[PDB]
Each structure stands twice: as C-alpha cells, then as structure tokens.
Amino acid sequence: SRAKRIMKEIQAVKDDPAAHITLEFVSESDIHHLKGTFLGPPGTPYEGGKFVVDIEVPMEYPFKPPKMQFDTKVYHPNISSVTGAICLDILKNAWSPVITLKSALISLQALLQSPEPNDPQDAEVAQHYLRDRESFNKTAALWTRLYAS
Numbered sequence: 001s002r003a004k005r006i007m008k009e010i011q012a013v014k015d016d017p018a019a020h021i022t023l024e025f026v027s028e029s030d031i032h033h034l035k036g037t038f039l040g041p042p043g044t045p046y047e048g049g050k051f052v053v054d055i056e057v058p059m060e061y062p063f064k065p066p067k068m069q070f071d072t073k074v075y076h077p078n079i080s081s082v083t084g085a086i087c088l089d090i091l092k093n094a095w096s097p098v099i100t101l102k103s104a105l106i107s108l109q110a111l112l113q114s115p116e117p118n119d120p121q122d123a124e125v126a127q128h129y130l131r132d133r134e135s136f137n138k139t140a141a142l143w144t145r146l147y148a149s
Contacts, residue, residue: 002061006031006101013102021105032057035071036105040148041113045140046074049148053108054084055101065095068104073147075140077117077126086111087121 013023026033034055040046052071058064068091070084078087090099090107120126129136 002057002059003031005062006034006057009100009102012100019102019106021102021109023101023105032061034101036068036101038105038109040144041109044113045137046112046144046148049144051108051112051148053105057101062097062099065091065099066101066104068108073143074112075125075136075143076112077115077120077122077129078111080121081125081143085121087116087119089119 010023010025013019013021020039022035022037024035025031026035034057036053036055038051038053040049040051049072051074054069054071056067058066068086070079070086072084073081074084075081079085086108088107088111090096090104115126115129117126117129125136128139
C-alpha cells in the first residue's frame, strides 16, 4: 500500500526535526503529492539555503521511484534551474523499495555537497563547475541567497 507507506514516512520525518528534512502533503485532496525540503549543507556554497522539492509518488511506490523535481531555483550541475529536473541515479535506474522519501531528500542534500558533473542535467553548469570552481561556487552561493532564502 502506497498510502500506508507514505503515512509511516510522514511520521518518521515529523519525529526527527533535527535532521532538517520536512515532508508535507500539498493538499487535503490526496496523499501522493508532497513537498519535501532540506537545508543546504554547511561549509558549502549552499549553506543557509532551504531547498523545496516537489514530490509525486506513483501508484507502485515503493517499488517505483517517486517523481522529484526542485521548486527552488538552484545553480548546480545535476539540477535544471529552469525545470527543477534532477539527474540522480536513485531517481532513475538505481531505485530500491527500501529507499524512503526522507532518504531521497538526504541524498539530494548530499548531491549539493558533492556535485556529479560526470552525469549533468545542465551541461553548461557542469562545464562551469569543472572549468572554474571558484566562480561556480560564488554563483551557487549567490543563487542560494536569492532563491533559497
């Protein structure tokens, strides 16, 4: 049961606030649309940011991956600053029924801390990250101030 899974997951996240992950339904009309958020990793250009991720869980969840895309405009090799689309294996080909939405959200936070330019969503941003890190970081940090406040 998708619904049974989701309500368990909601409780698991609500009871552990210090993890700085949140999970909420979008509306009262269903339980398959949610918003997840996580805080930017400290010591990182994204520190101080709060990142919001749109989640749609499929009928087959947890045996199919949830559809996740950023609502927050982020400057990052694996996230589209236009569509919020994410390039991350667990969301595509490496999904496992044991993975939770909280876990996925934590993996997205880990993605901010450790960009994966070798499989970019945005080729230019991945190119920027590699070509001129210092300049990349200044942009990521400005965008965190602008769009993730």
